[PDB]
Design a protein around this ligand. Structure first.
Ligand SMILES: Cc1cc2nc3c(=O)[nH]c(=O)nc-3n(C[C@H](O)[C@H](O)[C@H](O)COP(=O)(O)OP(=O)(O)OC[C@H]3O[C@@H](n4cnc5c(N)ncnc54)[C@H](O)[C@@H]3O)c2cc1C
Ligand SMILES: Cc1cc2nc3c(=O)[nH]c(=O)nc-3n(C[C@H](O)[C@H](O)[C@H](O)COP(=O)(O)OP(=O)(O)OC[C@H]3O[C@@H](n4cnc5c(N)ncnc54)[C@H](O)[C@@H]3O)c2cc1C
Ligand SMILES: CCC/C=C/C/C=C/CCCCCCCC(=O)O[C@H](COC(=O)CCCCCCCCCCCCCC)COP(=O)(O)OCCN
Ligand SMILES: CCC/C=C/C/C=C/CCCCCCCC(=O)O[C@H](COC(=O)CCCCCCCCCCCCCC)COP(=O)(O)OCCN
Lengths: 425, 425
């Protein structure tokens, strides 16, 4: 008999189980994998021996994320300022200049006018409310259709389409404008603040903060896949893959949105929620770490190819480096090494590919998707309630975060609300 | 006894008299000066013999001003492109960059936020309604207080404050924020569109378009300053200072706004209009053509000096050159030759000043004004009423324009309205 059972051992699960234990509650953590952290995946490189690489994500903003900075200050995890870019090799047409802002002086008027349209539509969205309660049905259309409404000149059009396919991790025909404007609204109402918010990085990786949080949790059961949560009786029963089952008064679900459908809930989750969970969000984001030779430090290649963004990651040696590429799993196939070469040679012909390192998050049964990006029409119907508790069962994660979706801060912010509901209720 | 008498030989007055005569009406032109065109002053330079310069203004845009191009396509008068800028000498701080857009990348996020607030408030103005009846009283406050509300970084602030001093011809503490937003609203809701509307210019000066329009008007009287209008009887009486008087069914007043105090109206103008007319607008714009040597080919200087804008005008020779400086009559003394030497020294210390050429429109009794720029409060109280007919007396010009004020287009647009009102009424 536990006070709370936390399903999942990610940043939401590691914080929720820890904070409840400190109050005096008997907490059990159930992780279905062989490791804790989740999408904060920090391992040794498959390409280079003795090179610690971030498969998930490290980048962060100190003033943007106070809770994340509070955890760094608590355990003493140091953060250094993020690397800047010096070299630029874009493929945004012949009239584009190769620098930080590739937009020519001819487009300046139209970009200025489009900035207003993008900001105004984003300023409509309130972060404290939901994407369902603000009459934002007119903004939930395919991204490519919404981008054409701006009628952007060649360079500004493709530059915005490249970063959107980076950030959302889904092509313009699949991506929703509402979620694109949500990401603007989430980043202090700023279209530039989506990219320029990469202020500081994890110096030792996410692994240091993951292990430090796990140290203050007394009971963790690894390789324990939860297949169902049942709150029939007076207490909530949690059943597991391997037969067994656990029981607790309250239950924390700290698993990604695309994995909730694999869990049988009794009684079933509210009708508003049901249908979107079964089909899942259209997050197909793909991150490949290319091991290269003949590449300089601080290159940024934002163009129009199958790799919309290809830029510098870290130094391997004197000549060898790592380039990080962003695309989607549906469009690009990472298993074709010839397709990798053709994508890199599109931006840098002199640079040769030595190897690749990635993780297929959409293929993994414990995630079925990387970070949150809804399909056209999903979050207009239900969004706020997806992270709102149903009985004794709480739903947390970066997928349900209203303030910072798809960020480590969002994982800690949502889990904090779940702990507050149990202790003060 | 005429069908209509147009008072003023400016672009508004010439168009009003011409279009009515072409319609088949008996029209009389009355100009108090020794020349036609008005603020369209294009004559020989005082410093350089033979060289023809624009004392008033020639900077037009075929896209922003479609009616000005309609006259240029009518008479076949050609126009040449803008004097592009290559050299940049800015005084916006060490953080600024010496380019066309001097705002650094450190302020890129700050401009983004300030652009929205400036555009949103500009979009709040409907051009057709008028500034007096749109509830914009909160925007009709001193410019220095408005710019402080946005809270701008050193460069982005002073770059906006310098161009505002030029475009309005008023210092920040005297200029109205509503009028600054009006210029943006008139320029297709664009801050960059205000500056990037120095597009094409008159190849032979404004005199080409002035003399072409005047030769289609039969009855023109030069050196006839109108002292009053009387519409009390069956027909409207127009009294002159010499050669008094004249008679017509309709009367058009195309004289500058600040001269309407001198003309006595019977019956007196509506109570709404008497408040602003009898004090006039606070526009003090001072354009100074400075003859120099040792100056670069295509300089642009924007800073925090008494000359907010000092840029390249035209090539005098391979050594000697003509520059143009914008300021106001109150803050700067154009008679003081030593003050011009010091003001140019602030931006270009290696440049010798030889002579100056200007014309004070403030001191001129025929103008009492340069181009229109209202005082704080004036245009939120009464605006469109000033350009509306006072019975049989029609009011036109660029001063009372809503579509494009302070431009030759405004004189062109208003003249079309008054002619259509008399011909159809
Ligand atoms: C490519 C990429 C780039 C990123 N970049 C950034 C960035 O720049 N900045 C930033 O702040 N964040 C970034 N992140 C996002 C961040 O890594 C995640 O949002 C964060 O790890 C979410 O933590 P969580 O605990 O809420 O969910 P998760 O970390 O996904 O935790 C879920 C855990 O539950 C387990 N689980 C799933 N199903 C079951 C089950 N049925 N039974 C038991 N356990 C189960 C999973 O194994 C997993 O360990 C990035 C992520 C990716 C993938
Ligand atoms: C320094 C400067 C720069 C400019 N730059 C530009 C520019 O770059 N682009 C642009 O589009 N526009 C520019 N203009 C603005 C434009 O020239 C004017 O605002 C306006 O178009 C002038 O035409 P108007 O017919 O409205 O007035 P006016 O041309 O002044 O017409 C009124 C005429 O009536 C006469 N008059 C006055 N009183 C009497 C009376 N009592 N009886 C009889 N006649 C009288 C006056 O002598 C005057 O000639 C500039 C103006 C100035 C001063
Ligand atoms: C009331 C008056 C208000 C003052 C208005 C200030 C506007 C400044 C106009 C100066 C810009 C003219 C050209 C700019 C680009 C340029 O020429 O030179 C360009 C450099 O500029 C660019 O191409 C990128 C700029 C994109 C910015 C888009 C949004 C701008 C924000 C609006 C401005 C806000 C200012 C205050 C908040 C390069 O080479 P070109 O000339 O061959 O291309
Ligand atoms: C969901 C998708 C969101 C996509 C957002 C795409 C934005 C990515 C921008 C990344 C580049 C940042 C440029 C910052 C400046 C810089 O460092 O590069 C500078 C040049 O840039 C500038 O001078 C700043 C110009 C000011 C523009 C402000 C207006 C906002 C524009 C809105 C953008 C609209 C996008 C198109 C619709 C190089 O000289 P510097 O380093 O010496 O100075």
């Amino acid at each position: 008999m536990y006070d709370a059972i936390v399903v999942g051992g990610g940043f939401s699960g590691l914080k929720a189980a820890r904070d409840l234990t400190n109050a005096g509650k008997k907490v059990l953590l159930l992780e279905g994998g062989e490791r804790l952290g989740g999408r904060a995946y920090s391992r040794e490189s498959r390409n280079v021996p003795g090179l610690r690489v971030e498969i998930g994500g490290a980048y962060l903003h100190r003033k943007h994320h106070p809770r994340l900075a509070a955890e760094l200050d608590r355990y003493g995890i140091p953060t250094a300022a993020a690397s800047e870019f010096t070299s630029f090799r874009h493929r945004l047409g012949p009239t584009a200049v190769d620098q930080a802002f590739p937009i020519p002086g001819s487009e300046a008027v139209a970009v200025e006018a489009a900035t207003y349209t993008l900001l105004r539509d984003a300023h409509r969205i309130d972060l404290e409310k939901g994407l369902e309660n603000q009459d934002l049905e007119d903004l939930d259309i395919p991204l490519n259709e919404y981008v054409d409404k701006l009628d952007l000149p060649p360079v500004s059009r493709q530059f915005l389409l490249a970063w959107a396919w980076n950030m959302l991790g889904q092509p313009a025909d699949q991506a929703s404008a509402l979620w694109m404007l949500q990401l603007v609204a989430a980043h202090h109402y700023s279209i530039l603040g989506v990219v320029l918010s990469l202020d500081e990085v994890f110096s030792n990786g996410s692994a240091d903060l993951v292990d430090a949080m796990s140290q203050e949790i007394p009971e963790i059961r690894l390789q324990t896949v939860v297949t169902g949560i049942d709150q029939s009786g007076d207490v909530v029963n949690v059943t597991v893959k391997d037969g067994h089952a656990f029981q607790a008064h309250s239950v924390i679900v700290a698993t990604p949105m695309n994995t909730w459908r694999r869990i049988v809930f009794t009684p079933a989750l509210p009708e508003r929620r049901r249908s979107v969970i079964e089909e899942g969000h259209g997050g197909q984001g793909l991150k490949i770490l290319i091991h290269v030779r003949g590449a300089e430090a601080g290159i940024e290649c934002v163009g129009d190819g199958i790799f919309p963004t290809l830029y510098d990651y870290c130094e391997v040696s004197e000549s060898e480096r790592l380039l990080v590429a962003f695309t989607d799993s549906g469009s690009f196939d990472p298993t074709d090494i010839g397709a990798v070469k053709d994508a890199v040679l599109y931006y840098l012909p002199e640079v040769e590919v030595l190897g690749i390192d990635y993780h297929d998050w959409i293929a993994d049964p414990l995630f079925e998707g990387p970070w949150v990006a809804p399909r056209v029409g999903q979050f207009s119907r239900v969004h706020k309630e997806l992270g709102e508790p149903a009985g004794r069962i709480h739903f947390v994660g970066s997928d349900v975060s209203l303030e910072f979706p798809g960020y480590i801060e969002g994982a800690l912010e949502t889990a904090e609300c779940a702990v507050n509901a149990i202790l003060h209720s």
